[PDB]
CSV table of N, CA, C and O in Angstrom, one decimal:
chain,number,residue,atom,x,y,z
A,127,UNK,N,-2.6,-112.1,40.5
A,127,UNK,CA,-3.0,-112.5,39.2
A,127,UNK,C,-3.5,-113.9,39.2
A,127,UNK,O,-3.2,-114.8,40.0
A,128,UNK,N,-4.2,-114.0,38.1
A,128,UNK,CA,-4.5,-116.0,38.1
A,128,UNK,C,-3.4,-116.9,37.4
A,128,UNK,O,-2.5,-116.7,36.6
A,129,UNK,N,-3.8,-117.9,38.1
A,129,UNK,CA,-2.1,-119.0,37.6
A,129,UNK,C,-2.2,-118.7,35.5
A,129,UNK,O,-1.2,-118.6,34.8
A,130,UNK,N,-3.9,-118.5,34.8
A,130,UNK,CA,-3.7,-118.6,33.8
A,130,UNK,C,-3.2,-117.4,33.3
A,130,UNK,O,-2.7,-117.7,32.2
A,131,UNK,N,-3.1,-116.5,33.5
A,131,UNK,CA,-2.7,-115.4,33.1
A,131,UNK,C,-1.0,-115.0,33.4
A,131,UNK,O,-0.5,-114.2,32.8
A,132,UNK,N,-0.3,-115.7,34.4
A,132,UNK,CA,0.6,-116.2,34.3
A,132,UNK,C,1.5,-116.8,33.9
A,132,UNK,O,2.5,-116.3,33.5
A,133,UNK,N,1.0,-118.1,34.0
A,133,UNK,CA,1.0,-119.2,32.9
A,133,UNK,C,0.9,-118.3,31.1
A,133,UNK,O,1.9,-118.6,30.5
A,134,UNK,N,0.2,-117.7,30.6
A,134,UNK,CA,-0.1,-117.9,29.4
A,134,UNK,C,1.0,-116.6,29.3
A,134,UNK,O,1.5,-116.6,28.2
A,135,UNK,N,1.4,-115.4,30.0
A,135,UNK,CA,1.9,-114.5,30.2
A,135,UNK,C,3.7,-115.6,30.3
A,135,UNK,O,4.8,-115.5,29.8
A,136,UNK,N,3.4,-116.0,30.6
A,136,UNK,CA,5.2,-116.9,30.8
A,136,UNK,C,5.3,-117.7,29.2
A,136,UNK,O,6.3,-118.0,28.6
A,137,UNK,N,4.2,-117.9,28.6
A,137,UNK,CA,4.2,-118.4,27.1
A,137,UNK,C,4.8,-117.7,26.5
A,137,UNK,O,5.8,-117.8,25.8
A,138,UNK,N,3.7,-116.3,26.6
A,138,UNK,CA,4.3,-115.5,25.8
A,138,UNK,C,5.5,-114.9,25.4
A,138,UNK,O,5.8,-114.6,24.3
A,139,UNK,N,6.5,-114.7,26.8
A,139,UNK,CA,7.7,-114.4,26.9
A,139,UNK,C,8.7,-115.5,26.5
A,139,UNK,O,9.7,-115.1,25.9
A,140,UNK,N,8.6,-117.0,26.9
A,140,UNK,CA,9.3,-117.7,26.5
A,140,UNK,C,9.5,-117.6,24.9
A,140,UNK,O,10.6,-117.6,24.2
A,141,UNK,N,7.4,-117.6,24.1
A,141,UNK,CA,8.1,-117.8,22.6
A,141,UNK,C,9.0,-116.4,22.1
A,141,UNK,O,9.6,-116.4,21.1
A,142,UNK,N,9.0,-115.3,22.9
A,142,UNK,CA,9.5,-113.9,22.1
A,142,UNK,C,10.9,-114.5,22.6
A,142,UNK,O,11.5,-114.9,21.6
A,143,UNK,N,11.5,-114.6,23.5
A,143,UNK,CA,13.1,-115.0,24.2
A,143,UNK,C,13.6,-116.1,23.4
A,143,UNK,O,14.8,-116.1,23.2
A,144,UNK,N,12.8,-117.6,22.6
A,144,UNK,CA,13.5,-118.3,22.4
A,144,UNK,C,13.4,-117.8,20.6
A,144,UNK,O,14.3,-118.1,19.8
A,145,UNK,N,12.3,-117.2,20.1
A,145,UNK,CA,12.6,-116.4,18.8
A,145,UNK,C,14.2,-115.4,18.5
A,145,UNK,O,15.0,-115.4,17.6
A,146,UNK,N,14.2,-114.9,19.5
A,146,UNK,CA,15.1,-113.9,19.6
A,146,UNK,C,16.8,-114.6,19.8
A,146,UNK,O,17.9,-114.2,19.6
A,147,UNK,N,16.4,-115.8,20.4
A,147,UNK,CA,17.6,-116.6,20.4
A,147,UNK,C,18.3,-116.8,19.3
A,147,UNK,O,19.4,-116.6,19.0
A,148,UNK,N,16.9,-117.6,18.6
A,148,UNK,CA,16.7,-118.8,17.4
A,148,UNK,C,17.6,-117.9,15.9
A,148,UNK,O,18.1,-118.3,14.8
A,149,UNK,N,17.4,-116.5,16.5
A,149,UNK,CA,17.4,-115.5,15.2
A,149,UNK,C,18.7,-114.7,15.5
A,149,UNK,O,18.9,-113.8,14.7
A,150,UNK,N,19.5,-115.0,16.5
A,150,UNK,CA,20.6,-114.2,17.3
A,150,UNK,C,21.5,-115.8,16.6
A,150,UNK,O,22.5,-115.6,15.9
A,151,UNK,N,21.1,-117.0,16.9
A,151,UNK,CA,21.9,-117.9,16.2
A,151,UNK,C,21.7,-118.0,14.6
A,151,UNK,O,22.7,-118.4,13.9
A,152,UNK,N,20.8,-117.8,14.1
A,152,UNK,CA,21.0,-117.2,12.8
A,152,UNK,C,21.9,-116.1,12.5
A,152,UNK,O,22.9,-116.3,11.7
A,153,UNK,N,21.8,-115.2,13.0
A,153,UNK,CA,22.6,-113.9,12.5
A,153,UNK,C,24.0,-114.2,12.5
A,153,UNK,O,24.7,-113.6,11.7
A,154,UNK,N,24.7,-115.2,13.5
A,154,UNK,CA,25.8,-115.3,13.2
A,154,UNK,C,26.2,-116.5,11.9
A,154,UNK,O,27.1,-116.6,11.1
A,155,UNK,N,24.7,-117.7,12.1
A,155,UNK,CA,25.5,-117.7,10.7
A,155,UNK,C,25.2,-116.6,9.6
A,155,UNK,O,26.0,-116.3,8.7
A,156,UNK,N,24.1,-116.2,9.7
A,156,UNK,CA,24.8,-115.1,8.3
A,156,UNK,C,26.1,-114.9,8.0
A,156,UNK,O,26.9,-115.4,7.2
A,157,UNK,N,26.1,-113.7,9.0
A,157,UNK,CA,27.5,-113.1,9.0
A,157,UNK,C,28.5,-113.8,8.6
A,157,UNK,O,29.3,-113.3,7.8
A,158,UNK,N,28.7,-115.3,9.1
A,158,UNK,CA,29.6,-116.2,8.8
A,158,UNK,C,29.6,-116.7,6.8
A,158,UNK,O,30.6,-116.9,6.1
A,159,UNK,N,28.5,-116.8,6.6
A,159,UNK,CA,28.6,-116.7,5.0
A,159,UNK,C,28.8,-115.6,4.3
A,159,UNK,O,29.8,-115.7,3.5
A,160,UNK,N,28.0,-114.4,4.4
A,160,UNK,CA,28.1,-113.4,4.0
A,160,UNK,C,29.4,-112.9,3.8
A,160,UNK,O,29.7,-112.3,2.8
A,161,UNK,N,30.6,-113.2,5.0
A,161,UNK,CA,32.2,-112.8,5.2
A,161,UNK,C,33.0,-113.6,4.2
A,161,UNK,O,34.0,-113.3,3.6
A,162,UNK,N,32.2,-114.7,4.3
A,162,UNK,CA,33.1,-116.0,3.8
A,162,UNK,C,33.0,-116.3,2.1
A,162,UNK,O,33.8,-117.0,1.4
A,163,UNK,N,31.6,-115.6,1.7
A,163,UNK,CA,31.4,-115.5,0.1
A,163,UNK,C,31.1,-114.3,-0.6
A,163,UNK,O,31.6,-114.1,-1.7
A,164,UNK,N,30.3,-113.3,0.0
A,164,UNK,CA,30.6,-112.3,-0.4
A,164,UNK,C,29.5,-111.7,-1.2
A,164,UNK,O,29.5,-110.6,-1.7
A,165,UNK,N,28.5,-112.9,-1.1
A,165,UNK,CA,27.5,-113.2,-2.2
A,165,UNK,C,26.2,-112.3,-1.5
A,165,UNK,O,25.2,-112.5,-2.2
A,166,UNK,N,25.9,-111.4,-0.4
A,166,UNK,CA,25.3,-111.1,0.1
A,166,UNK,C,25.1,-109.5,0.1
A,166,UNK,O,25.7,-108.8,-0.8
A,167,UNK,N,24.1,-108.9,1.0
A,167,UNK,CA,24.3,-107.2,0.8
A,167,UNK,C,25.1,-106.5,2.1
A,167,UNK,O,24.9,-105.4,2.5
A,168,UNK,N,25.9,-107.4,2.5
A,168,UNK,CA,26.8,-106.8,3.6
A,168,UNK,C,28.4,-107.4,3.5
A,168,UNK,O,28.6,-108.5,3.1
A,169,UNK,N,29.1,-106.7,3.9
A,169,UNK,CA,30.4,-106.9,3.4
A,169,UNK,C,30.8,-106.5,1.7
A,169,UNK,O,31.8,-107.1,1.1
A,170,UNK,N,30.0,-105.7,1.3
A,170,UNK,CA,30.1,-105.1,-0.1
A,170,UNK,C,30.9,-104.1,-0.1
A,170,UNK,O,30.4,-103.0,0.1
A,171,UNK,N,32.8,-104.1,-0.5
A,171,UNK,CA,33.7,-103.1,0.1
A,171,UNK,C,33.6,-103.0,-1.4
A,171,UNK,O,33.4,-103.8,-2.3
A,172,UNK,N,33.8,-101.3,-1.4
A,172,UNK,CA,33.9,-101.1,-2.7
A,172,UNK,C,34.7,-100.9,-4.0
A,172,UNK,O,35.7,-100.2,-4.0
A,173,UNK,N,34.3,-101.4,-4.9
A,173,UNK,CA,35.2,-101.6,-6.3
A,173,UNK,C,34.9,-99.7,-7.1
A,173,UNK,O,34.2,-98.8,-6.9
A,174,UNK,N,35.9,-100.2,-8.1
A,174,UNK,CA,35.8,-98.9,-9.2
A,174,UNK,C,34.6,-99.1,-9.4
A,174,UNK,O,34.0,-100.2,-9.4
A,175,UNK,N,33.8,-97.6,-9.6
A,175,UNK,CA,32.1,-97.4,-10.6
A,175,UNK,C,32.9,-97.2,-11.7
A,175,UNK,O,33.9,-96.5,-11.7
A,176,UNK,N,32.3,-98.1,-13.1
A,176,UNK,CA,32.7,-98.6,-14.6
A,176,UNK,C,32.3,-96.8,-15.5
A,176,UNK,O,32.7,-96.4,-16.6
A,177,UNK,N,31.5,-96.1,-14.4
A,177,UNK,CA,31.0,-95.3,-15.2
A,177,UNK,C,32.1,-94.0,-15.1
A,177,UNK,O,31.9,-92.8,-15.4
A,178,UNK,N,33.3,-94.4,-14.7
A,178,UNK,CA,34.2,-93.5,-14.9
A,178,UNK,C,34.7,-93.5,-16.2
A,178,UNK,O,35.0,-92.5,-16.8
A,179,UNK,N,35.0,-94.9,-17.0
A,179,UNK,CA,35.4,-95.3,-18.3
A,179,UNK,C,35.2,-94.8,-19.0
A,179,UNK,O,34.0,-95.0,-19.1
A,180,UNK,N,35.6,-93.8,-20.2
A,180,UNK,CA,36.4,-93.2,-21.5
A,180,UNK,C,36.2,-94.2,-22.6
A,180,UNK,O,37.1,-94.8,-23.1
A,181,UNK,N,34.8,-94.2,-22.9
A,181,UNK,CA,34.6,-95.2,-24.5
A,181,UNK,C,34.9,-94.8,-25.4
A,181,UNK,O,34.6,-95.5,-26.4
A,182,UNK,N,35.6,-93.2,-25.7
A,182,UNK,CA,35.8,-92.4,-26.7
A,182,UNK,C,36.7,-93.0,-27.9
A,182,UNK,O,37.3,-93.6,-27.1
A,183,UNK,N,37.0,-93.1,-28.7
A,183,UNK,CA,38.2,-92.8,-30.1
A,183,UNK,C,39.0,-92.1,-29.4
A,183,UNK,O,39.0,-90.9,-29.2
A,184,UNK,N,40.4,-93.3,-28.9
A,184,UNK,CA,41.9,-92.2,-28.3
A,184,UNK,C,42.4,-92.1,-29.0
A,184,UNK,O,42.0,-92.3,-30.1
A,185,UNK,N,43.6,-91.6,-28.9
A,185,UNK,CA,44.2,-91.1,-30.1
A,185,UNK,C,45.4,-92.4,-30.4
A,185,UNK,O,46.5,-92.0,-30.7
A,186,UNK,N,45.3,-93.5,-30.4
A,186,UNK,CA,46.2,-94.5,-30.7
A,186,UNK,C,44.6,-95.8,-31.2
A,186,UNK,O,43.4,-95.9,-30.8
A,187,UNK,N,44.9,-96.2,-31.7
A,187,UNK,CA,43.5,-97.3,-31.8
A,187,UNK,C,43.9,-98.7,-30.9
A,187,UNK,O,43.0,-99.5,-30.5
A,188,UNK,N,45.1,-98.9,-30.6
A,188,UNK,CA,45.4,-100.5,-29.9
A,188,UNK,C,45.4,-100.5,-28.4
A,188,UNK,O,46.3,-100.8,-27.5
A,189,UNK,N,43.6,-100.1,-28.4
A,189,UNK,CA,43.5,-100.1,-26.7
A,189,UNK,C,42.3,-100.9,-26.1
A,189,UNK,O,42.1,-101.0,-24.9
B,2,UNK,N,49.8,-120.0,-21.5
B,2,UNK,CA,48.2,-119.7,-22.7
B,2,UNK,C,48.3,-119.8,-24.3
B,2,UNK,O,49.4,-120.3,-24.6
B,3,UNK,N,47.6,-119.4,-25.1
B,3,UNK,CA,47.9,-119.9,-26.0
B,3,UNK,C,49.0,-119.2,-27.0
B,3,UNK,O,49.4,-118.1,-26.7
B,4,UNK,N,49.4,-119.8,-28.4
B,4,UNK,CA,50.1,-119.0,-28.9
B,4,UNK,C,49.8,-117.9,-29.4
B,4,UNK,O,48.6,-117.7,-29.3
B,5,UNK,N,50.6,-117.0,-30.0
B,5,UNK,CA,50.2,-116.1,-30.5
B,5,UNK,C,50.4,-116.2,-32.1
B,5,UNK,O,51.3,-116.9,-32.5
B,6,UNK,N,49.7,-115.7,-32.8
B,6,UNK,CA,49.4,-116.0,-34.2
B,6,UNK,C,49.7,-114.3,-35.2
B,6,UNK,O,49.0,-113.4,-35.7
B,7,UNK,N,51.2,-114.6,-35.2
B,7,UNK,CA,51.6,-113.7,-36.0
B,7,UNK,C,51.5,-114.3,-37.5
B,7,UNK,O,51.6,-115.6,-37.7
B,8,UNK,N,51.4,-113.1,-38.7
B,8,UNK,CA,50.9,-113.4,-40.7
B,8,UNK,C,52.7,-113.9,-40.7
B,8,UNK,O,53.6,-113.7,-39.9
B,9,UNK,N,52.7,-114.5,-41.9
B,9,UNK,CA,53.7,-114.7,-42.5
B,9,UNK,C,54.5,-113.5,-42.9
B,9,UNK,O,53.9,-112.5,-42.6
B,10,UNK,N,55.8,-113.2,-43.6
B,10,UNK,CA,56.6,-112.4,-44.0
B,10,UNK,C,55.9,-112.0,-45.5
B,10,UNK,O,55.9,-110.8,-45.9
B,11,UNK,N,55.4,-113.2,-46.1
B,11,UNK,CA,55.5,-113.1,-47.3
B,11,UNK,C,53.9,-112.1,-47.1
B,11,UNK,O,53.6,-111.3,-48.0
B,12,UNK,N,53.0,-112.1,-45.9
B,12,UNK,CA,52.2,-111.3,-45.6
B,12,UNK,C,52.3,-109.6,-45.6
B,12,UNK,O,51.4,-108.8,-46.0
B,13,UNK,N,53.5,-109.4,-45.0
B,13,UNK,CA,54.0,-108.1,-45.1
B,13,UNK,C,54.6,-107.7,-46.0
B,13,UNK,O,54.9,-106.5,-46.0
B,14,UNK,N,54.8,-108.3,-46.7
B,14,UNK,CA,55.7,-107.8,-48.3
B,14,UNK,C,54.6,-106.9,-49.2
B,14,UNK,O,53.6,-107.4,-49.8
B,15,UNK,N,55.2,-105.4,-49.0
B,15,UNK,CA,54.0,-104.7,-49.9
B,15,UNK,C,54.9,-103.6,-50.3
B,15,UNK,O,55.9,-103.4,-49.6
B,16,UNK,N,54.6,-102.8,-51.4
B,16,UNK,CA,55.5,-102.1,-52.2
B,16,UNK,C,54.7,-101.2,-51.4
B,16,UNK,O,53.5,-101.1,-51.3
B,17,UNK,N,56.4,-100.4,-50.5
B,17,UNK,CA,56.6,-99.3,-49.8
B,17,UNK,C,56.3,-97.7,-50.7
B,17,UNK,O,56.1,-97.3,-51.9
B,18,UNK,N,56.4,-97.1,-49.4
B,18,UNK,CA,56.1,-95.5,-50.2
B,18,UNK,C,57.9,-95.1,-49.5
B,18,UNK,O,58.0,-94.7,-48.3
B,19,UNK,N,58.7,-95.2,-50.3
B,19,UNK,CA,59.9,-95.0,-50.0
B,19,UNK,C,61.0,-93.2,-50.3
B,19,UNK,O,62.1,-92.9,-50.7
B,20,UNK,N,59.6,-92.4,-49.8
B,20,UNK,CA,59.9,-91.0,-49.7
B,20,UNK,C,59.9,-90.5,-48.8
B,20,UNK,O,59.2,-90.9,-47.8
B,21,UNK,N,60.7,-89.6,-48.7
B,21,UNK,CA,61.1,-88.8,-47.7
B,21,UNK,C,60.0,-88.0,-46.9
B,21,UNK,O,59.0,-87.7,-47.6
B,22,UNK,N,60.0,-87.7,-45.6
B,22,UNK,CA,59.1,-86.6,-45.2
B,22,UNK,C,58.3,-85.7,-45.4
B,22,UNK,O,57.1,-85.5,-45.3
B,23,UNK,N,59.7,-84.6,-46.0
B,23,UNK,CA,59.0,-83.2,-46.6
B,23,UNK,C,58.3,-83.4,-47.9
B,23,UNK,O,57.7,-82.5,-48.6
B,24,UNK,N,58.3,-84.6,-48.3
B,24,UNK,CA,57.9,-84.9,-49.4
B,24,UNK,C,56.5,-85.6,-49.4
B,24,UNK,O,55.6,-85.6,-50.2
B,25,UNK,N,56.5,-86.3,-48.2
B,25,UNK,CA,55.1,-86.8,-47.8
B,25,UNK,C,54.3,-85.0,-47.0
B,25,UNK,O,53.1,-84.8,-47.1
B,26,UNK,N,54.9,-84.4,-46.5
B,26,UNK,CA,54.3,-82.9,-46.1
B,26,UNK,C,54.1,-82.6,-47.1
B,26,UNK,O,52.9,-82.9,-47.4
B,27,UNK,N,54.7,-81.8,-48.5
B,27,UNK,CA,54.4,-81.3,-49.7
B,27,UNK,C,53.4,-81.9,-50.3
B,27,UNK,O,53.1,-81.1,-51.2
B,28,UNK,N,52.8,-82.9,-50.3
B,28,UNK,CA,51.6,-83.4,-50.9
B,28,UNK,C,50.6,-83.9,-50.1
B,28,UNK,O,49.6,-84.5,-50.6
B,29,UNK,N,50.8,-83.6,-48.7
B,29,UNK,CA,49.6,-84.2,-47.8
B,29,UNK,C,48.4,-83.5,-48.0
B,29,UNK,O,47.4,-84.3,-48.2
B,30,UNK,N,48.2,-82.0,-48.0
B,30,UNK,CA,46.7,-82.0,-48.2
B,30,UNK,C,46.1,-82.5,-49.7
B,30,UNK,O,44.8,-82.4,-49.8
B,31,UNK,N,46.9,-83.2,-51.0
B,31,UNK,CA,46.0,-83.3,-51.8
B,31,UNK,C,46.2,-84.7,-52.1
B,31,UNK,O,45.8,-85.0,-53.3
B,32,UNK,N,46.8,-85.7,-51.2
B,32,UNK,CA,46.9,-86.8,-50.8
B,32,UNK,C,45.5,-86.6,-50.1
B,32,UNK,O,44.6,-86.9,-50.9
B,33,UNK,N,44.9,-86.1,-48.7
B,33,UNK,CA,44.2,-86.3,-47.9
B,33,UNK,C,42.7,-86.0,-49.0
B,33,UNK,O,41.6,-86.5,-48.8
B,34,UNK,N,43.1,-85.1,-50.0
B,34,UNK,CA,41.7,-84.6,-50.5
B,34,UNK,C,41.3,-86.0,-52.2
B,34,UNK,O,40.4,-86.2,-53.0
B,35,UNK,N,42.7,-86.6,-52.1
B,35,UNK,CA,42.3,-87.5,-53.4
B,35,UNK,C,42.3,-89.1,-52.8
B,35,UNK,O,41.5,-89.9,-53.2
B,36,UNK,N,43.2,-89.4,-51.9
B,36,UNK,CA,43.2,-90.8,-51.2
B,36,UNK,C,42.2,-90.6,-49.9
B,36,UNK,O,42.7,-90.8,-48.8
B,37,UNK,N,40.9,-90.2,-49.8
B,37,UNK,CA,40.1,-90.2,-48.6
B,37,UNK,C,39.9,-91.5,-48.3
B,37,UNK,O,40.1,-91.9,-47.1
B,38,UNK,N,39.1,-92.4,-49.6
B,38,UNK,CA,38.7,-93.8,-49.2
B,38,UNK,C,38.9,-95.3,-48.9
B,38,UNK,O,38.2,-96.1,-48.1
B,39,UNK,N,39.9,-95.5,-49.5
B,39,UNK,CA,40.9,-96.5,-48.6
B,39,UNK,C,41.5,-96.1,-46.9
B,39,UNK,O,41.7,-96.9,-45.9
B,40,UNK,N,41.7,-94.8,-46.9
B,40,UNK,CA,42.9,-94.3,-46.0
B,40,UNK,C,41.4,-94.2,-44.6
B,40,UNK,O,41.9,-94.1,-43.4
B,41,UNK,N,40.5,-94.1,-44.6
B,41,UNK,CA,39.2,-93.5,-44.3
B,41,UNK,C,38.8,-95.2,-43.5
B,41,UNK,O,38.5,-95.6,-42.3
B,42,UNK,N,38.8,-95.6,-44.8
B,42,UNK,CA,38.1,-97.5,-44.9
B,42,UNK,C,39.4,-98.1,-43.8
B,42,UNK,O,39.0,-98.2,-42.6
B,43,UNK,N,40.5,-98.4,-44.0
B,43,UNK,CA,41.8,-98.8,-42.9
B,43,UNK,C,41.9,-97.9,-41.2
B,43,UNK,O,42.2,-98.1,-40.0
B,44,UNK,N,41.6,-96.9,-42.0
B,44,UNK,CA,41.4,-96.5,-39.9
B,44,UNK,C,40.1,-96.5,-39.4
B,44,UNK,O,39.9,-96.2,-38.2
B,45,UNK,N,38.9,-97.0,-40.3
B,45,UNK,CA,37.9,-97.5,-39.6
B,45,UNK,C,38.3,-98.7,-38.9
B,45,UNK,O,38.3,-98.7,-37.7
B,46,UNK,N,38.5,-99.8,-39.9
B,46,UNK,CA,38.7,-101.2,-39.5
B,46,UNK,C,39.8,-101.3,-38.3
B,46,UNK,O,39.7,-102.1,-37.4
B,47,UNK,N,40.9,-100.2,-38.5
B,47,UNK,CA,41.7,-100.2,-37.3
B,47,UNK,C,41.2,-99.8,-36.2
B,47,UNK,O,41.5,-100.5,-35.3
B,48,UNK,N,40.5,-98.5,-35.7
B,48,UNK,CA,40.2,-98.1,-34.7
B,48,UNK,C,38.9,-99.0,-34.5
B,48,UNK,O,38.4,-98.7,-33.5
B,49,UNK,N,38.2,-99.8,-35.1
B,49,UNK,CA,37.0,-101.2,-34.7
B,49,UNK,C,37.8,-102.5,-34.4
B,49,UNK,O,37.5,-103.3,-33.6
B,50,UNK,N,38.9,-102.6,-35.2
B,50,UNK,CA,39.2,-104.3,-34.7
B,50,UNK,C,40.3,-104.0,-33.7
B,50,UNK,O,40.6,-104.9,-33.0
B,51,UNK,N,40.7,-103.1,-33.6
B,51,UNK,CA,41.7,-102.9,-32.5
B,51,UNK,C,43.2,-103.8,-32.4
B,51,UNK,O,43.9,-104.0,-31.4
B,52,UNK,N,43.3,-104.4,-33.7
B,52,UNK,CA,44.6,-105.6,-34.3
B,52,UNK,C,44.6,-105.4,-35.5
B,52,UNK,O,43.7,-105.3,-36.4
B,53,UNK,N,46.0,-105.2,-35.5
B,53,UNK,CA,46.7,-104.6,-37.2
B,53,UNK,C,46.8,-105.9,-37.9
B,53,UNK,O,47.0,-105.9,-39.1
B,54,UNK,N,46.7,-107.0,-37.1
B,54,UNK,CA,46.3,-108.5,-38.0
B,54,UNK,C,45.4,-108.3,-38.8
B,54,UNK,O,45.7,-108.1,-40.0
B,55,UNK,N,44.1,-108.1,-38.2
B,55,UNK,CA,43.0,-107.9,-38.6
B,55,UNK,C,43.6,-106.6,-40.0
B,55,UNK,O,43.0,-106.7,-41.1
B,56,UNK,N,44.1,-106.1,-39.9
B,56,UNK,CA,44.1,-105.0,-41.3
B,56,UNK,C,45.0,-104.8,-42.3
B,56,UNK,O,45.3,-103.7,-42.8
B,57,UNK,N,45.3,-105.8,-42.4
B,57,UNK,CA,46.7,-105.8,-43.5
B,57,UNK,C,46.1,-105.5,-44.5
B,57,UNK,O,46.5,-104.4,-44.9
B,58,UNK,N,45.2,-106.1,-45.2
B,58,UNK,CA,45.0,-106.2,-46.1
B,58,UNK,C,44.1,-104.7,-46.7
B,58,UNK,O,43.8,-104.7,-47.9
């Protein structure tokens, strides 16, 4: 092969290896917020659905 | 938290219905057919305000 093809073939792999870094050290801070607030779409453990609730007239009124 | 805000006594002071049972049964259906609108109007406001504060009156 020629040194430029090489060369430009060794670019290419460096920028995909240090993206893939850059984004592997991202992901843990996600995770690290996401765990820590809650404020995110992972770590969403689940609560009651509201749509079980009984809006009806019970039979006592002081509810 | 905060207090709670119970009426005065002199608030509850209301001339009772001081009969007996069978005596409130013996006239319920024409109690229910001549007192509809007060009795109608009080369990609205009660079953909406959900506080018997709210409905003394």
């Amino acid at each position: 092969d020629a040194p430029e093809k090489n060369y430009e073939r060794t670019m290419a792999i460096l920028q995909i290896e240090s993206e893939k870094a850059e984004l592997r050290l991202k992901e843990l801070e996600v995770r690290r917020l996401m765990r820590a607030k809650g404020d995110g779409p992972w770590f969403q453990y689940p609560t009651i659905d509201k749509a079980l609730i009984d809006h009806s007239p019970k039979a006592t009124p002081d509810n | 938290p905060g207090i709670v805000e119970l009426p005065s006594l002199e608030d509850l002071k209301v001339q009772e219905v001081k009969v007996s049972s069978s005596v409130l049964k013996a006239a319920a259906h024409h109690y229910g057919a001549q007192c509809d609108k007060p009795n109608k109007e009080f369990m609205l406001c009660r079953w909406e305000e959900k506080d018997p504060r709210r409905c003394l009156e």
